[PDB]
Write a protein that holds these residues in place. Structure first.
Motif, PDB file in Angstrom:
ATOM      1  N   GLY C  57       0.821  -1.192   0.000  1.00  0.00           N
ATOM      2  CA  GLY C  57       0.000   0.000   0.000  1.00  0.00           C
ATOM      3  C   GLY C  57       0.859   1.247   0.000  1.00  0.00           C
ATOM      4  N   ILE C  60       2.248   1.546  -3.535  1.00  0.00           N
ATOM      5  CA  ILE C  60       1.292   1.905  -4.576  1.00  0.00           C
ATOM      6  C   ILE C  60       0.870   3.378  -4.436  1.00  0.00           C
ATOM      7  CG2 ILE C  60       0.365  -0.410  -5.082  1.00  0.00           C
ATOM      8  CD1 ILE C  60      -2.100   1.712  -3.491  1.00  0.00           C
ATOM      9  N   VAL C  61       0.526   3.795  -3.231  1.00  0.00           N
ATOM     10  CA  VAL C  61       0.047   5.140  -3.041  1.00  0.00           C
ATOM     11  C   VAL C  61       1.163   6.145  -3.326  1.00  0.00           C
ATOM     12  CG1 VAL C  61      -0.773   6.744  -1.279  1.00  0.00           C
ATOM     13  CG2 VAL C  61      -1.813   4.482  -1.494  1.00  0.00           C
ATOM     14  N   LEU C  64       1.787   6.511  -7.123  1.00  0.00           N
ATOM     15  CA  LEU C  64       0.718   7.233  -7.790  1.00  0.00           C
ATOM     16  C   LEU C  64       0.867   8.729  -7.525  1.00  0.00           C
ATOM     17  CD1 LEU C  64      -2.343   7.139  -9.021  1.00  0.00           C
ATOM     18  CD2 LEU C  64      -2.972   7.187  -6.580  1.00  0.00           C
ATOM     19  N   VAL C  99      -1.207  13.661   0.606  1.00  0.00           N
ATOM     20  CA  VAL C  99      -2.113  12.570   0.378  1.00  0.00           C
ATOM     21  C   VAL C  99      -1.372  11.275   0.635  1.00  0.00           C
ATOM     22  CG1 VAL C  99      -3.512  11.345  -1.355  1.00  0.00           C
ATOM     23  CG2 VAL C  99      -3.636  13.837  -1.157  1.00  0.00           C
ATOM     24  N   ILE C 103      -1.745   8.236   3.992  1.00  0.00           N
ATOM     25  CA  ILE C 103      -1.917   6.808   3.986  1.00  0.00           C
ATOM     26  C   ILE C 103      -0.660   6.087   4.457  1.00  0.00           C
ATOM     27  CG2 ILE C 103      -2.439   4.853   2.498  1.00  0.00           C
ATOM     28  CD1 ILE C 103      -4.191   6.787   0.928  1.00  0.00           C
TER      29      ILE C 103
END
Ligand SMILES: CCCCCCCCCCCCO[C@@H]1O[C@H](CO)[C@@H](O[C@H]2O[C@H](CO)[C@@H](O)[C@H](O)[C@H]2O)[C@H](O)[C@H]1O
Ligand SMILES: CCCCCCCCCCCCO[C@@H]1O[C@H](CO)[C@@H](O[C@H]2O[C@H](CO)[C@@H](O)[C@H](O)[C@H]2O)[C@H](O)[C@H]1O
Ligand SMILES: CCCCCCCCCCCCO[C@@H]1O[C@H](CO)[C@@H](O[C@H]2O[C@H](CO)[C@@H](O)[C@H](O)[C@H]2O)[C@H](O)[C@H]1O
Ligand SMILES: CCCCCCCCCCCCO[C@@H]1O[C@H](CO)[C@@H](O[C@H]2O[C@H](CO)[C@@H](O)[C@H](O)[C@H]2O)[C@H](O)[C@H]1O
Ligand SMILES: CCCCCCCCCCCCO[C@@H]1O[C@H](CO)[C@@H](O[C@H]2O[C@H](CO)[C@@H](O)[C@H](O)[C@H]2O)[C@H](O)[C@H]1O
Ligand SMILES: *C/C=C(C)/C=C/C=C(C)/C=C/C1=C(C)CCCC1(C)C
Ligand SMILES: *C/C=C(C)/C=C/C=C(C)/C=C/C1=C(C)CCCC1(C)C
Ligand SMILES: *C/C=C(C)/C=C/C=C(C)/C=C/C1=C(C)CCCC1(C)C
Ligand SMILES: *C/C=C(C)/C=C/C=C(C)/C=C/C1=C(C)CCCC1(C)C
Ligand SMILES: *C/C=C(C)/C=C/C=C(C)/C=C/C1=C(C)CCCC1(C)C
Lengths: 283, 283, 283, 283, 283
Positions: C57, C60-61, C64, C99, C103
């Motif tokens: 996670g 991936i975050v 991006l 952002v 996370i």
């Protein structure tokens, strides 16, 4: 007699919003379908993997087509006053369906025959005829609806629609004859499922010509909206419903092979909450 | 009485920055959720794979929806002075949630029932009713909030909101009755988890109507901001929290099948650090 | 006292080229990290799969986020003379880090605790507190640095930075107390690795406030450049270094479970070229 | 003598719509092919995995090329009156095929030789020569058709076409000699399939020069359309048909190794509905 | 002395078409390489999985870099008359190579050492030194070629090129010493392959400085074209050729471990058509 093509109509805000919703709904539903196919691919034996391959292809090409159309939709109309006015790219919100169908209808034919009981020359004869017929039905449809006359000629739509209808009949007969020949050679449980699945694909096919008839008979934003709603809805129902149905038959035939000793499967197969075969290993 | 739609409000720099953050946060959280689903898919037996399929679909569709909205957000407002002024694309920062929900709420229904004890005609009856009800609740919501009146008609919002509320009640009752019937037929441990999970989905559903009521009652940048914060936050909580909860029940029911000899599982199942079943192989 | 935000500074060609490099370097490094995580996911037992999920996670975050920022960078400055002048999109080269962190810092907390020895109420209490604290530290940071005052208010940066610092302290204490309680209950080898890994995450966290202090104290192209270099470099070091470290502990604890008979693993586990456990199969 | 290049012709609406369809059809077909390759990769033993690798590469590169071309097509013509007029991007609807072929024709050579019975220095000699020859045939084609003279020089097209033809002959002879040497050392069943597959690749190659001859001899929208239809159709037929054929041979040789005890395979191998080998496990 | 940077030159149509081809060829080749890596990852034991991880990273980062550059190329030149004239984005057709190399050269170092026999403190010392040296060689190159002087200063190119050359020498010596120490501790077959692979990486490295020297000495469209052709070609040869070579050594060392009883492997390992080890299962 000239008519106006569907991508030539100006849309009210309501119509523009409805079309966006249906296109995005279909693309999303198909992307779910793709994921479903990938996640459940191990439930089917290697003897019936064509079912999974065919279905994967339907879901991939349909998804891509709708993603393209949703983006085209955002660029193919300009808000002018209270209307959305189509520009030169509006045709890319209709024409890509013909691309999708050009692959998906042949792949549906292949999926249906993948779980039937045919082999040898007949198998290849049937698969080729059905693929060819299916492709030609869509392509002749595309010529009438998009290419010859630019979608504006009633005569062209009628002629090419009639030609497309002939290929429809031919493909249908070829498929129905194959299924009918297979049903006696399947177990009762599979035969029953295969017969049902066959009615769903043929019946689902009859919805699509209705959107073509709208293009012939009626023009306006409401009609463009209607075309997109009918075709989006048919795409959802046919490409989730039918694909689920062949997967179940492939699972059932896999499980019957496992219980007969014809093959082994690495996991247990469950169908509607009931265990059909146990997980096994090679000796 | 006319109101202004949420996508019609000009935003301060603060509001524009907050909305960007929440949209990007939600998209990112959902993409994590997708990855989680994929990485943990082998923890669940084939008897309960619908749980994984349903959850994968929720996460894929929701992610795509938010990615679309984040891009729409970057193109749907223009910085003019100290304000961000919405253009004709601003509606694509609100409307795609209805697409997401149109798939995800039915898939949640399917996920919840995937681990319940039904089978038979009742199973299919319940799954269809719950899917249909769930879809109609969102679709009638979309008509009031986006389509009929262009999001500007109080009467339309009230009428279609009331209709959406009826479908909400129906779907809820259908699901609650199913769970209530299942709980006696589950092991105590699973029954307890399933009951808890059911309260979280229903309770999570009650947050969404609140954003609809804002649209009815208040307009402005602060209210648009509030709508996005509430809906983003609900999306995060419902689509990470609930999905985790059904996965745990599917794992527990898998492990109970392994210990009962109903099936085997290739790996050991761990739940909250405690081993529930051992890894096994077919005889 | 008003200051200028980092995304308001004009850049020389040198600065513009350096920022592009660091953003693209970070995005690329993180995409490698994602691939690494996927390729090495089977080295860890199911008892410690949360480590892999958390790390997936983060990667991936973060990826991006940086891809978004690299594209924003290409669109957020216009070459005018010998300077790159920021437009209204330049803020999207800074804000998306918040952002990502919103996370990733909670997921780091989860990763660290995934290999510790806690269970029961305490486990859930700790995980929730640490996730909440971690999220609030970033969110209050985002309010000061981007939202309240538009990044231009020294008072707002100081106040919200102080609030963010409190949540930092709280989260740190919660995590350190958890690790300290775990270390006695781990094998010496794991305890030692876990202690080291804990210092690297906390120490890595202290770099980020330095970029915030720059925003408070200095404005200009050189300072914008410095902020991006510091934050890019910290992102690389923290999200490749630390993630590798927890993976090793998860591997070691897996191997210790295999040797203790607590579980089996399908492949052998190698750590620093030395075999820790053999490949095994269920009886 | 100067001619006009294919990307210089204005298109009628019919032609523009036909080209879009064929490009999108090819991209979609190739994306299906990619999925097929991935889903069927486990049907082939490790001894013949080069077949799968080669085919995956053909499908990935070809798909990317067509996706690029479809997007270029949308941006490379402007609707002006009743004509689509090419801008400076229209060349990107033709030139990317040369990129695709530059990889795919060498990979086809590798795929064909992957299932042949050849090893040692000769194997490496043959693979290098065939790869080199294949690359040079396409590259010299690209020079005549796109680069030297800008696609407008008949002399350049003729000279570079002749050079490309020589490399064609050389590559063909090298491949045919390899197959001819292999056929005696294969089982009859494989030998027969390999011979057939060889005719399909060579025959498929002869279609492509025909599009080059059109460029030399005829210019106009109809001819541009013809070029795209011929090349799209050849791409579909060669990259779905031939790839299927080598996969079958790799499956058959795998199954023959399993039955000979040379290797084991985890699943049963089915070819045309008939079981060729059983699933097995290492002792 | 001022020179013009490579991205400042106007291109003829021939040059523009050649550069497009080479960039797209490289991106495509690298995407094939990525797929190859993924498809062949199970041929290598867990003891040597770093080889696969390193190679995956090289292929992912390089692919992304070239995709970025191909898109930048389409936007970084404008057709004006018979020339393509570079705009402010043209630098993004050159600078992203430095990003790629900043990751890939360190990952190559890691890949080479992954199959060598160093371990302990020396292993970590060597890996860190080689990674650091490799990164600094590229970064100092980037400063001279892109950042300091904007690529237009001969003095800056010379100074930073010399610095980059020192780091080149250091990294090379560190790697060569490691290999030289390993070769005596490997089996003859592996030692021979490792020595060959080492010459290919070092020799491949010597091509890149040649493009830097062009930038120093010559400016114009032909020279820009030459730079792109040399660097594209080197990227293809180094990132397909070398990666294949380490994979073979990792396979061979895996197979030697299987035959020695050090580990088991799930499939048989084939190298150049010859079986090196049998498929096995844990006792
Ligand atoms: C224009 C658009 C037209 C689209 C047409 C597409 C045609 C190809 C359809 C798929 O093509 C078909 O793939 C399946 C894949 O399992 C292959 O089937 C083969 O493999 C499966 C296992 O995977 C075996 O069970 C089967 O017995 C064997 O024949 C078929 O031999 C091949 O003909
Ligand atoms: C408007 C938008 C509405 C969207 C709804 C779309 C989802 C409806 C279909 C749900 O799809 C559902 O998938 C699962 C996949 O595990 C299938 O379930 C089947 O396979 C699983 C997995 O092996 C078995 O455990 C199960 O016993 C069997 O019935 C269901 O038979 C099918 O109905
Ligand atoms: C705002 C953004 C904040 C984001 C925070 C997200 C928090 C939840 C993410 C992690 O969520 C956590 O996932 C792991 C996945 O293994 C689950 O863990 C569960 O499965 C693993 C196996 O996979 C078992 O070893 C474990 O014992 C069991 O509890 C946890 O039950 C769940 O709580
Ligand atoms: C310009 C563009 C030109 C592109 C040409 C690319 C050529 C290289 C690609 C194929 O490269 C080839 O990959 C296969 C992958 O299985 C390798 O093959 C190796 O692995 C397979 C298993 O996977 C074994 O069965 C085989 O015996 C062994 O040699 C070859 O050793 C390698 O040479
Ligand atoms: C600018 C940025 C440049 C960044 C370059 C990359 C940084 C170094 C990354 C190296 O990442 C490396 O991954 C392998 C993955 O197998 C790990 O290696 C570990 O796992 C493998 C199995 O997978 C075992 O065989 C090995 O014994 C064990 O040490 C290394 O411990 C780790 O150090
Ligand atoms: C998943 C997509 C499917 C099943 C599409 C089906 C489309 C048809 C059956 C179309 C048929 C047509 C005719 C019979 C007449 C002319 C118009 C067509 C092409 C729509
Ligand atoms: C993950 C997404 C979820 C669970 C979304 C849920 C949405 C609802 C429950 C919406 C309900 C509505 C009403 C009951 C009335 C007003 C209109 C709606 C659509 C917001
Ligand atoms: C991978 C990303 C990580 C670990 C990011 C960490 C970020 C922080 C630890 C930020 C802390 C901050 C403060 C303590 C003060 C205010 C500013 C912040 C948000 C940067
Ligand atoms: C999948 C793509 C394939 C098989 C492409 C094949 C292309 C050729 C065989 C091209 C050959 C040519 C000549 C022999 C003459 C000059 C023109 C060429 C490049 C089209
Ligand atoms: C896959 C990419 C590779 C192997 C790239 C390698 C690049 C170099 C070896 C660059 C070296 C340089 C110098 C030694 C001098 C200055 C210029 C450089 C950076 C090109």
């Amino acid at each position: 007699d000239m008519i106006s093509a569907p991508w030539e109509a100006s849309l009210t805000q309501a119509e523009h919003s409805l079309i966006f919703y249906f296109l995005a709904l279909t693309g999303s539903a198909l992307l779910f379908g793709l994921a479903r196919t990938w996640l459940t691919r191990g439930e089917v034996g290697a003897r019936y993997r064509t079912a999974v391959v065919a279905r994967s292809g339907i879901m991939i090409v349909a998804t891509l087509s709708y993603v393209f159309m949703v983006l085209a939709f955002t660029s193919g109309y300009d808000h002018v006053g209270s209307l959305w006015v189509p520009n030169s790219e509006a045709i890319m919100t209709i024409a890509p369906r013909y691309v999708e169908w050009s692959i998906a209808v042949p792949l549906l034919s292949i999926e249906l025959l993948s779980v039937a009981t045919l082999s040898g020359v007949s198998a290849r004869r049937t698969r080729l005829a059905a693929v060819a017929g299916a492709f030609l039905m869509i392509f002749t449809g595309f010529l009438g609806a998009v290419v010859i006359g630019d979608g504006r000629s009633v005569g062209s739509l009628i002629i090419w629609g009639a030609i497309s209808t002939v290929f429809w009949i031919i493909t249908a007969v070829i498929l129905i004859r194959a299924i009918r020949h297979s049903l006696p050679q399947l177990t009762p449980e599979a035969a029953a499922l295969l017969k049902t699945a066959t009615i769903f694909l043929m019946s689902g096919w009859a919805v699509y010509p209705l959107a073509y008839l709208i293009q012939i008979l009626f023009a306006g934003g409401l009609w463009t909206t209607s075309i997109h709603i009918i075709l989006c809805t048919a795409d959802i129902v046919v490409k989730l419903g039918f694909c689920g149905l062949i997967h179940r038959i492939a699972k059932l035939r896999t499980a019957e092979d496992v219980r007969a000793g014809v093959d082994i499967h690495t996991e247990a197969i469950w169908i509607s909450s009931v265990k059909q075969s146990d997980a096994g290993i090679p000796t």
